[PDB]
Amino acid sequence: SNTIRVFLPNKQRTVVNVRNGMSLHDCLMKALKVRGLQPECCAVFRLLKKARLDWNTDAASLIGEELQVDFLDHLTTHNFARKTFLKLAFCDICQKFLLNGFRCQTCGYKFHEHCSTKVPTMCVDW
Amino acid sequence: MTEYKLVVVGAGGVGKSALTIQLIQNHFVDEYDPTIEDSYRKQVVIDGETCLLDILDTAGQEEYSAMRDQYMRTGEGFLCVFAINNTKSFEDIHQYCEQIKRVKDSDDVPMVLVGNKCDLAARTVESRQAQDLARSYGIPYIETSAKTRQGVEDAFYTLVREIRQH
Ligand SMILES: Nc1nc2c(ncn2[C@@H]2O[C@H](COP(=O)(O)OP(=O)(O)NP(=O)(O)O)[C@@H](O)[C@H]2O)c(=O)[nH]1
Ligand SMILES: [Mg+2]
Ligand SMILES: [Zn+2]
Ligand SMILES: [Zn+2]
């Protein structure tokens, strides 16, 4: 099979299909995008104890291998908390009136409870 | 926050990945790239509490059927998906649930039967037939459509509510 096991950040994993001529940076874009990640914010290894690979590496050069994608040095995960906004605030998703909702103190993202799944997956500023 | 190990099972092409990706990214995947194993972690607020859903998107292809016994002992709740425009997928999900109760060795496993692709008008599986199967297992049933996002959050949130008590 033309498959590669790839371990993604935030304790996630996928199994990508490989086409001859296709790149590694392009083969893992979909899996990284649907998880709120960017490849140029990440460095891809190949497990051996890991060997760093360049993002332009041919995806056929590692068929049957197990890779891992990690963050560079110098954030992730939100810390949601119930907050009732006295200062006039609106949601960050639907931009409508928000008085009783939730907010992550780390990111400052404010939203309604029914507006929870449209919050970006990754969180900045730790 | 509370973590929930959700598992999405079902025959091939019923819309498991399209349902999961719709929940976490609000996109609609209209391409069909078959899944082998996909892991998603997304933080969610259900009924006022912060939930981190560790959703396991499984393979519907019969080549990876041996993986069923593996993830059907790890997961806490199972989203058993079929396509309302595909009668073969409705009976395929019948033995998915029966296999879950057997390897869980329980008659009370958090499950949510989900009929997908309800935006389509060429329906061949009545909801009566689906609620018949859902009531026989004592599990809820929720019609969804990964394209129009109808009932997508309802199906995932219902399974979390089933795990929360149990
Ligand atoms: N109209 C419509 N199409 C849908 C819906 N859900 C999925 N599809 C389509 O059906 C096809 C299969 O979707 P997919 O999510 O890959 O199904 P799957 O169960 O994950 N397949 P597999 O088990 O092989 O991984 C895709 O072309 C997708 O766009 C839906 O609700 N409505
Ligand atoms: Mg899939
Ligand atoms: Zn945040
Ligand atoms: Zn909102």
Alpha-carbon distance of B51 to B47, in angstroms, equals: 10
Alpha-carbon distance of B33 to B105, in angstroms, equals: 33
Alpha-carbon distance of A8 to B1, in angstroms, equals: 22
A116/chain B closest Cα distance in angstroms: 6
Residue B43 and residue B1 in contact, taking contact as beta carbons nearer than 8 Å: yes
Which atom of ligand 1 lies nearest, measured to the CA of B33?
16
**Is B51 annotated among the ligand-binding residues?**
no
Q: Tell me whether strands A66-71 and A80-90 are parallel, antiparallel or unpaired.
A: unpaired
For residue B14, report the distance from its CA to the centre of ligand 2, in Å. 8
Experimental method: X-ray
Q: How many CA atoms lie less than 13 Å away from A66 in the CB half-sphere?
A: 6
How does DSSP classify residue B14? Answer: S
Asked whether the CA dihedral B99, B104, B106, B107 is positive or negative, the reply is: negative
The CB of B34 under 6 Å from ligand 1? The reply is yes
Alpha-carbon distance of B152 to B156, in angstroms, equals: 7
Q: How many CB atoms lie within 10 A of CB B90?
A: 22
Which atom of ligand 1 lies nearest, measured to the CA of B144?
31
How does DSSP classify residue B66? Answer: G
In the chain, the amino acid numbered B128 is R
Which atom of ligand 1 lies nearest, measured to the CA of B14?
19
Q: Do residue A82 and residue B48 have CB atoms under 8 angstroms apart?
A: yes
> Which chain A residues contact residue B16 at CB under 8 A?
none
Q: How many CB atoms lie within 10 A of CB B75?
A: 24
Alpha-carbon distance of B16 to B22, in angstroms, equals: 10
What is the number of the ligand closest to the CA of A108? 3
Closest CA to B2 of B47, B38, B58: B47
Q: Which residues contact B15 (CB under 8 A, 6 or more apart)?
A: B81, B83, B116, B117, B146
Q: Do residue B39 and residue A12 have CB atoms under 8 angstroms apart?
A: yes
CA distances from A41 to A23, A58, B149 (A): 17, 19, 30
Our measurement of the distance from residue A64's CA atom to the centroid of its chain's CA atoms, rounded to an integer in Å, reads 24
How does DSSP classify residue B48? Answer: T
Overall resolution, Å: 2.8
Alpha-carbon distance of B23 to A35, in angstroms, equals: 11
Which chain A residue lies closest to B38 (C-alpha atoms)? A14
In degrees to the nearest 10, what's the CA dihedral of B81, B138, B40, B47? Answer: 130
CA distances from A46 to A24, A55, A68, B38, B85 (A): 12, 12, 6, 19, 42
What is the domain class of B2-165 according to CATH? alpha beta
DSSP letters for chain A: --EEEEEETTTEEEEEE--TT-BHHHHTHHHHHTTT--GGGEEEEEE--EEE--TTSBGGGGTT-EEEEEEPP------EEEEEEEEEEE-SSS-SEEEEEEEETTT--EE-TTS-TTS-SS----
Residue B85 and residue B124 in contact, taking contact as beta carbons nearer than 8 Å: yes
Angle at B86 between CA B80 and CA B90, to 5 degrees: 35
CA distances from B72 to B19, B32, B84 (A): 19, 24, 24
Alpha-carbon distance of B60 to B14, in angstroms, equals: 9
List gaps in chain A by the residue before each (C–N > 2.5 Å): 48, 74
Six-digit token pair at A38?
Answer: 């960017």
